[PDB]
């Protein structure tokens, strides 16, 4: 993505599905790596690691890259620290909820839990 | 005094002898407020 | 902020989010390998927040009536007002 | 359960309430999806079974709010649904 | 927490169940007396109706309606409101007299020109002749009842032991009584104004029946409603019980992990 964004200088797009898997993967290696895990068992490098990746993806002055990232909320509890730390870095989110899925409405986007900076 | 009012007062008098059951006495008790209305607007509510 | 406070120029410091400081300290402490506290946050997490917050206060007229005003901006963990941070 | 749900293609959820209440196999049709296409089942069983999944999620809806005043439209659906 | 907020909410749900249980029982108790009254009332009505039938009396316009002050008695309040609305389309100019707060509120919303006379305080007691008489007397004086070319009373007929269907009937006008198809060897008094008196007499006698039918339907509905409430509440108990049980388990596990993490270091 960077190669297109910077050097080739055309508008790019980027889709990352499912970027919870990045977070999750880190948690898997973490135990073995040798770090006493943080609460809810996630890697104790959770904040930085999420940070390094998610701030590499940004609309530089070189070009603009609209990115779409999908986060698998584990257990479906959004309060869990690993999905939670994802929420900070996203300009718009459209949380899709299991309850609205049960009611039958597909797409299952929760209508009371979406926000965008553009909504303003 | 309507015809049924005429009968009503007579009935009330008839519950007067004193040997009469509570339910009789209860049938003579009443509690209501005729609230007049017009147009929206409400002329005041007053007991029957 | 203290430069304002000392100079006697009233000023106000917004620490947004203070909650993210706690997450940051958690990482830092836990890879120094200091004993992990309740809810995994460092053992002296209370001390971290207390030392930061107590450094803004109205000064006396002796000391030129300075005053840093502070606003921490803690994130609630999803509703839980009883969470450790 | 969720970790498994995420991996698999579709779920065929079975519901305790229906199982108890004498529907065996007790295949709840609210929570059974097949994310894998409908180009799985043979064309005959695609044609005949056309929209029946929808219809029985209309029976589901109808009987959801059946428990007020049932109009002939709801009743016809209810009669079909029940059969 | 999760645990405490769950737990308090479940306690609320439990308390709601207890109240809905209590009301449902008390409603049944009240209903037995209500039914007793309605039987007697209906018996009386048939005797008055015997004249009207045999006479074959064959009838702005007045509309009278009956509901209690009391709310939360199912859809008595709103089914009747709906049937008032239906016949309010028919005659635009009719004056509606509302006996009961609930029908007053609902009717006032749909057209706020209707309300001319209204009552308040009738609903909390069994039908009683005293009430009917007073309402009738005021109906004649205040509304000048004789002027209307149609009088109609609307009420909720307690159709079956689990149903109530809103119903209406026409109180015959004094003109009607006079010109009645068979006003044959009915009457002999040409001195006493038997039409103008009988009109008044049946204004109340009919109204009492309507009020009585209504009171029974109302209490019957409240019993039905509170029964369905208890069931709905039960379902909520069961659903939140599962949530409670899960939440409790989760707290034990999550706490346990924290201790383990400490020991491990």
Curated annotation (Swiss-Prot), chain A:
**Predominant location of this chain?**
mitochondrion
Q: Where in the cell is it found?
A: Mitochondrion; Mitochondrion inner membrane
Alphabetical keyword list: ATP synthesis, ATP-binding, CF(1), Hydrogen ion transport, Ion transport, Membrane, Mitochondrion, Mitochondrion inner membrane, Nucleotide-binding, Phosphoprotein, Transit peptide, Translocase, Transport
GO MF annotation terms: ATP binding; ATP hydrolysis activity; proton-transporting ATP synthase activity, rotational mechanism; proton-transporting ATPase activity, rotational mechanism
**The keyword ATP-binding appears for this protein:** yes
> What GO biological process terms are annotated to this protein in UniProt?
proton motive force-driven ATP synthesis; proton motive force-driven mitochondrial ATP synthesis
Family the entry assigns: Belongs to the ATPase alpha/beta chains family.
Q: How does it assemble?
A: F-type ATPases have 2 components, CF(1) - the catalytic core - and CF(0) - the membrane proton channel. CF(1) has five subunits: alpha(3), beta(3), gamma(1), delta(1), epsilon(1). CF(0) has three main subunits: a, b and c.
Per its record, how is this protein called by name?
ATP synthase subunit beta, mitochondrial
Q: Which organism is it from?
A: Saccharomyces cerevisiae (strain ATCC 204508 / S288c) (Baker's yeast)
Q: Source organism lineage?
A: Eukaryota, Fungi, Dikarya, Ascomycota, Saccharomycotina
Parent-protein residues present? 273 to 392 of 511
From Swiss-Prot, chain B:
**Which InterPro entries does the annotation name?**
ATP_synth_F1_esu_mt, ATP_synth_F1_esu_sf_mt
Lineage top rank: taxon: Eukaryota
Localization (cell): Mitochondrion; Mitochondrion inner membrane
Pfam families per the UniProt record, alphabetical: ATP-synt_Eps (PF04627)
Instruction: List the Gene Ontology MF annotations in alphabetical order.
Output: proton-transporting ATP synthase activity, rotational mechanism
- Extract one GO cellular component term from the record: proton-transporting ATP synthase complex
One of this protein's GO BP terms? proton motive force-driven ATP synthesis
Q: Which UniProt keywords apply?
A: ATP synthesis, CF(1), Hydrogen ion transport, Ion transport, Membrane, Mitochondrion, Mitochondrion inner membrane, Phosphoprotein, Transport
Q: What is its main location?
A: mitochondrion
Keyword tRNA processing in annotation: no
Q: What does this protein do?
A: Mitochondrial membrane ATP synthase (F(1)F(0) ATP synthase or Complex V) produces ATP from ADP in the presence of a proton gradient across the membrane which is generated by electron transport complexes of the respiratory chain. F-type ATPases consist of two structural domains, F(1) - containing the extramembraneous catalytic core, and F(0) - containing the membrane proton channel, linked together by a central stalk and a peripheral stalk. During catalysis, ATP synthesis in the catalytic domain of F(1) is coupled via a rotary mechanism of the central stalk subunits to proton translocation.
As a miscellaneous remark, the entry gives: Present with 4280 molecules/cell in log phase SD medium.
The family annotation for this protein states: Belongs to the eukaryotic ATPase epsilon family.
Protein name in the entry: ATP synthase subunit epsilon, mitochondrial
Provenance organism = Saccharomyces cerevisiae (strain ATCC 204508 / S288c)
Curated annotation (Swiss-Prot), chain C:
Which parts of the chain span the membrane according to its record? Answer: none
Where in the cell does this protein reside? Mitochondrion inner membrane
Role of this protein: Mitochondrial membrane ATP synthase (F(1)F(0) ATP synthase or Complex V) produces ATP from ADP in the presence of a proton gradient across the membrane which is generated by electron transport complexes of the respiratory chain. F-type ATPases consist of two structural domains, F(1) - containing the extramembraneous catalytic core, and F(0) - containing the membrane proton channel, linked together by a central stalk and a peripheral stalk. During catalysis, ATP synthesis in the catalytic domain of F(1) is coupled via a rotary mechanism of the central stalk subunits to proton translocation.
Additional comment: Present with 41500 molecules/cell in log phase SD medium.
Its assembly, as annotated, is: F-type ATPases have 2 components, CF(1) - the catalytic core - and CF(0) - the membrane proton channel. CF(1) has five subunits: alpha(3), beta(3), gamma(1), delta(1), epsilon(1). CF(0) has three main subunits: a, b and c.
Family, according to the entry, reads as follows: Belongs to the ATPase alpha/beta chains family.
Q: What is this protein called?
A: ATP synthase subunit alpha, mitochondrial
| Taxonomic source organism | Saccharomyces cerevisiae (strain ATCC 204508 / S288c)
UniProtKB/Swiss-Prot annotation, chain E:
Q: Which GO terms describe its cellular component?
A: mitochondrial inner membrane; mitochondrion; proton-transporting ATP synthase complex
Q: Which InterPro entries match?
A: ATP_synth_F1_ATPase_gsu, ATP_synth_F1_gsu, ATP_synth_F1_gsu_CS
Provide the membrane topology annotation.
Answer: Peripheral membrane protein
Compartments reported by the entry: Mitochondrion; Mitochondrion inner membrane
Q: Gene3D superfamilies of this UniProt entry?
A: 3.40.1380.10
GO MF terms on file?
A: proton-transporting ATP synthase activity, rotational mechanism
Transmembrane feature ranges: none
**Result for mutant: residue 163 to I:** In strain: D273-10B/A1
Q: Name one Pfam family in it.
A: ATP-synt
Q: Which UniProt keywords apply?
A: ATP synthesis, CF(1), Hydrogen ion transport, Ion transport, Membrane, Mitochondrion, Mitochondrion inner membrane, Transit peptide, Transport
Biological process annotations from GO: proton motive force-driven ATP synthesis
State what this protein does.
Mitochondrial membrane ATP synthase (F(1)F(0) ATP synthase or Complex V) produces ATP from ADP in the presence of a proton gradient across the membrane which is generated by electron transport complexes of the respiratory chain. F-type ATPases consist of two structural domains, F(1) - containing the extramembraneous catalytic core, and F(0) - containing the membrane proton channel, linked together by a central stalk and a peripheral stalk. During catalysis, ATP synthesis in the catalytic domain of F(1) is coupled via a rotary mechanism of the central stalk subunits to proton translocation.
Name the family the entry cites.
Belongs to the ATPase gamma chain family.
Q: What is this protein called?
A: ATP synthase subunit gamma, mitochondrial
Which gene name does the record give?
A: ATP3
